[PDB]
Design a binder for this molecule. Structure first.
Ligand SMILES: NC(=O)c1ccc[n+]([C@@H]2O[C@H](COP(=O)([O-])OP(=O)(O)OC[C@H]3O[C@@H](n4cnc5c(N)ncnc54)[C@H](OP(=O)(O)O)[C@@H]3O)[C@@H](O)[C@H]2O)c1
Ligand SMILES: NC(=O)c1ccc[n+]([C@@H]2O[C@H](COP(=O)([O-])OP(=O)(O)OC[C@H]3O[C@@H](n4cnc5c(N)ncnc54)[C@H](OP(=O)(O)O)[C@@H]3O)[C@@H](O)[C@H]2O)c1
Lengths: 426, 426
């Protein structure tokens, strides 16, 4: 229809006031939201809309001449309070949404801006209380999608036992304002260079994600993940899929995601001999945040063996690719801010390099509004990535191997380049 | 065999003392010449080897410790004097070559460092006087290979009436020390991206040759050619061939040159509507040779309509390429020193970019020594390029259209970009 309700499960946290309210503001200001779109937040802290405004207007970049549009925006805003496992609270939320103009028939988009530890509760109550009877119901879940195959499997099974896959939207948007253009141009490259990309012409493919900045006083949150769960298992693996995939049956989201799943189902579990881990130490001669290392961050626990750099070799095992090594190299606190995919050819060796107005996160919100699931990891697709990376992560958490120390600013630990050479790179 | 004689027809000119003596020195110093190689020069001016040495040693970059190798080098040197159409002079040359150690059986490589106006004479006398009876005989001819289809045809017919094609080596080496790597990597790219390069995936191909420097006090020699005869008709057309060619039957020089000829035989004669010509004027705000324009060069005749920039659209007409425009854009005195080939794809539009120890000219001398004709335009291949570009050049010399004036440092006359847009570039 034409009436939409944007439920924000958790308006009192960072992601709410720092981004999603600003981003929805930015889409409304530019006339990109549906004309009949209400924004309804919901958390336990009792507070007025004006409190959200006083504590989240700084981040809007508002200018005096455009503020009347903002007044209409906040007329669209409303907020109610309640618990996350209180049936009466969800009933109050549902009745308040029904009270809005045409809220009975309206589409409902639930953004779970909550720590996944409460998801099991929320997804339940919504399912039995707040789902629309006429319009569609789409839920946006947030990272982490578990931390291993078992936890991710239990969470995804719980969520998919209540919502069809065309209602589950797993969003990921923390690696740059050009995050969607990456996958878009990589899909275009797979559609163009489809016939060339075989084991006959290519000897090795690499996928690189370098960042020049460290954790920057926030290594405490990064310490509970690791560089494998933060960059590799989700994004680099998705672009590996996009590189190695077959020609899709069409341009539907589900067909290309089927091809990505088919690619993932051919990658065996990575083992430690094909893995090089590294941790960045403070640069003695640099200045600024360059002087501090990973362990010099106060939020990082002492003795942390968490890797902030990883080089991993995977192999797609079919007829198109066999023995062709896919080298995923990523790392915080490096020499450049580079995100590229280089395919080296069977012959100095020659290689093809693929380097990178709706801006990423906004593009993603608009995809869930229109309904295109193109860029969201699908539930069965995730299980395969977690299967690939789970034994290695269990081994790392069990044995806790000391990551190779590398100097802040270096390209990486020399063992990574040695690993590349062992498999056949030069 | 093992004995070689390097005849240099014309040791008293620039190309002799500035390059070919230095280059052969550089190949001997590095042990790249055959061990039994004699260097024998020949021109009308009577002079000793020591005069060539006193006037060409500056250009050798000799260092005190390496000069004993140079003494052996000049022991290999010798020189005789005579006319270019005097039978007795060529008889003296032949007897002197026979006098050398094993000179009767030795291979003979004739380098015609002479203005082509005497070629007809030289190539005759050699054919009847100085060709070896046991070893091979290879002649290196030099630009210009004529100036239109008729003159080039008469010259090539005269030369090929005396020497087989595996004896004629048309050398071209004035556009950079990386001139051979260009064609090498372009051949590799054709062998790799063969299946992709069709009219289905590609909408437009461009081939760019930009130079940031002007004529630099030597516009008098450039004025008799034009930018079409200096860059486009020879080099850019060769790399167009290398891009659009089919898969060769093997890796022989003659098979790939057959493919290049097959490509050339499908390009019709270019007409003025697909041509944009430009002449560089002095930059008022720049400094140095930037202040002077093309007409400010004293060696340039007043009122010269010679084009120093050209943008030309050609079309290969077969089944692999049809309606696919090949845009050859070249120009002296520009913004960058760039030599690239960009293939634009059928969709912002995406494009594939191909940009560029034996160093070019040395690599070429070594190819004629070993005998690989890979990088030398073959006699039947040249005729096709001259056929393509002859009507346009006749029209330019007849009507003398004033080239579009463009500012020194600009990308080029706006009419070139307009021409690109007319054919379908964006
Ligand atoms: N790179 C990443 O992976 C990344 C980065 C940023 C955010 N995120 C995800 O984004 C989501 C939003 O989190 P946030 O960082 O923006 O802020 P947040 O403080 O984690 O959560 C926002 C709201 O959640 C409720 N909440 C927090 N902890 C709770 C608990 N233990 N029990 C019940 N309710 C609780 C509170 O609402 P009330 O107290 O008002 O009820 C709080 O204001 C999280 O799921 C987080 O994982 C991920
Ligand atoms: N970009 C280009 O196209 C380019 C650039 C450089 C050179 N070249 C070619 O390289 C070749 C070498 O020429 P160069 O520039 O190095 O010097 P050059 O002075 O043209 O020729 C060298 C020798 O040729 C003889 N010679 C010159 N004009 C003659 C004439 N009208 N009749 C008879 N003999 C004559 C003289 O020998 P003696 O007086 O001792 O007998 C002279 O020392 C030429 O064919 C030229 O076209 C081309």
């Amino acid at each position: 229809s034409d009436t939409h309700i944007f439920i924000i499960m958790g308006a009192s946290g960072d992601l709410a006031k720092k981004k999603i309210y600003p981003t929805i503001w930015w889409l409304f200001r530019d006339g990109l939201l549906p004309e009949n779109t209400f924004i309804v937040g919901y958390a336990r802290s009792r507070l007025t809309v004006a409190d959200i405004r006083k504590q989240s207007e700084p981040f809007f970049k508002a200018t005096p001449e455009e503020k009347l549009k903002l007044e209409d925006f906040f007329a669209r805003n409303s907020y109610v309070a309640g618990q996350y496992d209180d049936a009466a609270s969800y009933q109050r939320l549902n009745s308040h949404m029904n009270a809005l103009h045409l809220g009975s028939q309206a589409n409902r988009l639930f953004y779970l801006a909550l720590p996944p530890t409460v998801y099991e509760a929320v997804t339940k109550n919504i399912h039995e209380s707040c789902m629309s009877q006429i319009g569609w119901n789409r839920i946006i879940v947030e990272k982490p999608f578990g931390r291993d195959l078992q936890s991710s499997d239990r969470l995804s099974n719980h969520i998919s036992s209540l919502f069809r896959e065309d209602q589950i939207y797993r969003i990921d948007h923390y690696l740059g304002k050009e995050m969607v253009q990456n996958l878009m141009v990589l899909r275009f490259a797979n559609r163009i260079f489809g016939p060339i990309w075989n084991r006959d012409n290519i000897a090795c493919v690499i996928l690189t994600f370098k960042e020049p900045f460290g954790t920057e006083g926030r290594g405490g949150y990064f310490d509970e993940f690791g560089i494998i769960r933060d960059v590799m298992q989700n994004h680099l693996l998705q672009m590996l899929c996009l590189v190695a995939m077959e020609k899709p049956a069409s341009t539907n989201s589900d067909d290309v995601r089927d091809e990505k799943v088919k690619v993932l189902k051919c990658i065996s579990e990575v083992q430690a001999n094909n893995v090089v881990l590294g941790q960045y130490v403070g640069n003695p001669d640099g200045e600024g945040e360059a002087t501090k290392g990973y362990l010099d961050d106060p939020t990082v626990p002492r003795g942390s063996t968490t890797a902030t750099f990883a080089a991993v070799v995977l192999y797609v095992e079919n007829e198109r690719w066999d023995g062709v090594p896919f080298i995923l190299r990523c790392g915080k606190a490096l020499n450049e801010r580079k995100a590229e995919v280089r395919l080296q050819f069977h012959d100095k060796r020659n290689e093809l390099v693929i380097r990178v107005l709706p801006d990423a996160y906004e593009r993603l919100i608009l995809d869930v509004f229109c309904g295109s699931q193109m860029h969201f990891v699908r539930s069965d697709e995730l299980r395969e990535a977690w299967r690939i990376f789970t034994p290695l992560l269990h081994q790392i958490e069990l044995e806790k191997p000391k990551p190779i120390p590398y100097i802040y600013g270096s390209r990486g630990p020399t063992e990574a380049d040695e690993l590349m050479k062992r498999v056949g790179f030069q």
